């Protein structure tokens, strides 16, 4: 089980690797027009991460 969970992870850490894995936590200057781009978005990945 240990080796299982360890091998579960992925290090590429793309726009989506952050979406799936939830150990680490996001960050954004809220109202700084980047968070707005997320909230306005229609991108499924960006949609769920805005959520």
């Amino acid at each position: 089980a240990f080796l299982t969970v360890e091998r579960m992870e992925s290090p590429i850490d793309s726009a989506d690797d952050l979406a799936k894995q939830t150990k680490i936590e996001y960050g954004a200057v809220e109202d700084g027009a980047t968070m707005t781009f997320f909230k306005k978005s229609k991108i499924s990945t960006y949609d769920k991460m805005w959520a």
Partner: protein, 55 residues
């Protein structure tokens, strides 16, 4: 995504208890088999078998 767990007493501890029960039941059946061989040899009361115990 949070299930990387070492094993602990909370989830396996019962087999120590199983050890305890098996040990004690072995104790009782062993003394019973002692009495078995004892009565196989002589009448109910034994003292020479205490001598075999000591030796």
């Amino acid at each position: 995504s949070k299930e990387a767990s070492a094993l602990g007493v909370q989830n396996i501890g019962g087999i120590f208890i199983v050890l305890a029960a098996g040990l004690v039941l072995s104790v009782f059946v062993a003394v019973g088999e002692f009495l078995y061989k004892s009565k196989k040899n002589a009448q109910l009361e034994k003292r020479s078998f205490c001598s075999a115990m000591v030796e």
